[PDB]
Each structure stands twice: as structure tokens, then as C-alpha cells.
């Protein structure tokens with residue numbers, strides 16, 4: 098009965114955090130923002146410090162969840178993808194090539210100097226430099 | 238030692254949420270509000286979306302907990318009871334007849350068109366229509 | 378697989394709370410404040426009500442964590458130590474003699490009527506009366 102209780106209590110705490118607007122759950126992932134806007138490198142640091150990672154959508158469902166955060170907070174969001182070494186070749190921060198995409202029409206159109214990806218409030222993507230201030234969204 | 242640790246960490250997270258004023262614990266139940274006022278149907282949706290249910294007190298202790306939220310937020314609260322099909326016969330949303338009551342004197346006095354229950358800041362109840370804006374309180 | 382899941386979900390909720398700025402984790406301890414300032418006795422009550430205790434640093438790492446809260450909230454903080462019965466002899470609230478100290482130069486200089494300990498925003502300590510208003514920081 099220790100284990101049933103443990104699960105119930107976890108469900109309660111997650112429920113509270115969800116109600117408060119502090120987390121969104123999509124499958125195995127939890128997304129969260131504290132509402133702050135900073136550049137891409139600072140978002141990475143902020144998420145890592147919290148024990149998570151800069152958010153990236155790998156499915157339509159995850160894109161929709163992150164989009165809803167962009168919408169609720171009315172700001173563009175940096176995503177956990179880059180095209181550093183290879184150009185036009187976006188990779189997650191774990192090194193793996195991106196699969197799911199949701200590019201805004203015409204994108205990625207980027208310079209060799211647009212190594213980051215931002216999400217617009219409508220959930221679509223634009224390759225961009227990494228020094229803009231964007232909503233910090235993390236995944237856990 | 239995995240299990241002891243797990244319990245400690247749950248206690249910590251619940252402690253934090255409690256300190257922050259984001260949850261109240263009464264026996265097996267956790268109550269929470271995000272401070273928003275909406276109608277009865279929208280409260281149900283909001284609580285369900287968070288993984289919970291619109292709050293209802295089934296004991297004096299639960300009434301007191303929900304009352305304290307009504308007081309802290311200075312608003313009347315819709316409770317998880319209705320008298321839809323039967324009239325004067327209040328039921329929880331699980332279909333079961335209500336046991337514990339805390340009616341304000343003279344109540345329920347309601348029209349066939351007072352199918353919901355609201356709680357006043359003093360913890361007492363009034364049957365009411367369901368289209369008023371009331372503090373959203375959920376249970377998990 | 379129930380147990381792995383349970384651990385992941387706990388890590389997620391702690392991550393969210395950390396991101397939100399609602400908790401700091403140092404070893405086995407979690408520190409949190411709701412931002413309120415009250416006297417020493419009221420802090421004890423507030424922390425106990427949440428299921429925790431008034432915070433006290435017992436290591437350099439814990440002092441630094443509590444200092445960062447003092448800094449972020451720009452207020453002095455009461456710590457969980459007193460010199461009630463014995464004078465000049467500080468004890469934790471569990472009765473045990475204090476080990477780690479971080480006194481500001483000249484302190485403790487206190488009257489027999491400075492039975493509490495406050496922390497300055499720079500992390501150093503001053504013995505003080507207990508009736509001042511200080512930032513409430515709890516440990517769990």
C-alpha cells in the first residue's frame with residue numbers, strides 16, 4: 098500500500114502544478130516555463146540548472162504543447178535544435194538529426210549565421226541567430 | 238533505500254507546494270485553486286484538465302479547508318454537487334446522494350432552477366443557478 | 378517499471394518547482410520561501426504548518442543556498458538556531474549544539490536578550506532579538 102499511496106501523491110502534486118499553469122504533460126515529457134525571456138545559451142543554462150533541458154518538440158503533440166505556451170505567454174520561443182557544424186542540417190542537442198519539423202513557409206532560409214530555431218506563436222518554426230531574447234521553455 | 242528516498246522527496250515537494258499556498262491536504266484529498274473565477278461547467282472542465290475534479294466537502298474537515306480557501310481568496314466557491322434530475326435531492330458528481338451538509342439557514346430554498354451549490358466565505362452553502370462566476374477549487 | 382516511472386515523475390515535479398524558483402536542493406535538504414517576512418516564532422509556525430522546519434545551514438553549501446535566497450529576496454533571514462537557556466551557546470532547534478558557523482565580524486556580540494540568529498544578504502550571521510520581521514525560509 099506504500100506504492101499505491103506514492104503514486105496517488107505524485108498524481109496530486111502534478112495535478113496541482115498543472116492547475117497552477119506550471120507544467121504541461123505530453124506522454125513521457127513535462128514542459129514548463131517561468132515566463133522569462135533570455136538568449137538561447139542562457140535558456141540552456143536555466144533549464145539544465147533546474148535539472149531539465151531546453152524544450153524541443155519531436156512529435157506533433159509536443160509541438161502543439163509548446164505552441165500553447167508560446168501563445169499563452171505571447172512570445173517566440175527558442176527550441177532545442179541547432180545547425181552548428183553542418184548547415185541546413187538541424188540536430189537536437191543530443192547530436193541526433195531532427196525528424197519532425199514544422200517550418201514556416203520559406204524556412205529554413207537561413208544564413209550560415211542562423212544556427213538556432215525559434216517557434217512563432219502559431220507553432221511554426223524559423224531558423225534564427227541565437228542572441229535574441231525568447232521565452233524560456235524547458236522539458237523534463 | 239530507493240523507497241524511503243522516494244517518500245522523502247514527495248514529502249518535500251508537497252511541503253513546498255503547501256508553503257507556497259498552492260495546496261491544502263485533508264486526509265487523502267488535496268485541494269487547490271489557481272484563483273480564477275468561472276462558471277460551474279467551466280470549473281469542472283478546468284479541474285478535469287488538471288487531472289482532478291471540482292472540489293466537494295464530504296466531511297467537516299474538508300468543509301473547513303475549502304472555507305479557508307474561500308476566505309483567503311474572498312469569493313464564493315462552486316462545490317461538486319448538483320440537484321439536476323431529482324429536485325431537493327443533491328448528489329455528488331459521481332451520482333451518490335450527498336451526506337454531509339452545511340446549509341446556510343433557509344437553504345436549500347431553491348427553484349427547480351437552482352441546480353448548483355455555492356459556498357459562502359463563512360463555509361455555509363446556498364443552492365444557486367450554475368452560471369455565476371465563482372472561485373475554481375479542485376480536489377485531487 | 379512502476380518504480381522507474383515514479384522516480385522520473387518526482388524528478389519532473391522537482392524540476393518544475395526549481396525552474397519556477399520555488400525550491401533549492403542541497404544534498405538531502407530542500408529550501409523554500411514564499412517571500413513573506415514575519416518574526417521568528419511565526420516563521421517556525423509557518424514552516425511547521427507546511428510540514429517542514431525553519432531553515433538552518435549546517436554546511437557551507439547550505440549557507441550559500443540560504444544566502445542566495447536572502448539575496449534574491451533582498452531581506453535578512455532568521456535561521457533555525459537560538460541561544461535561549463545557555464548564553465553564547467547556540468543550538469539548533471533539535472537541541473544539538475551548533476557546529477558550522479558564519480558569524481559577521483564581531484558577532485555574536487549579543488545581549489542575553491539576543492537569542493535569535495539572522496543572516497545578512499551576504500550570508501554572514503548576526504545574533505539578534507527574535508521580534509524583527511525577516512524573510513521566512515523553510516527546509517524540508
Ligand SMILES: [Ca+2]
Nearest residue numbers: 185207208211
Ligand atoms: Ca542555417
Ligand SMILES: [Ca+2]
Nearest residue numbers: 206207223224
Ligand atoms: Ca530564417
Ligand SMILES: [Ca+2]
Nearest residue numbers: 325347348351
Ligand atoms: Ca433545487
Ligand SMILES: [Ca+2]
Nearest residue numbers: 346347363364
Ligand atoms: Ca438558494
Ligand SMILES: [Ca+2]
Nearest residue numbers: 465487488491
Ligand atoms: Ca546571546
Ligand SMILES: [Ca+2]
Nearest residue numbers: 486487503504
Ligand atoms: Ca548581535
Ligand SMILES: [Cl-]
Nearest residue numbers: 226227228229
Ligand atoms: Cl541573433
Ligand SMILES: [Cl-]
Nearest residue numbers: 366367368369
Ligand atoms: Cl445562475
Ligand SMILES: [Cl-]
Nearest residue numbers: 506507508509
Ligand atoms: Cl527583536
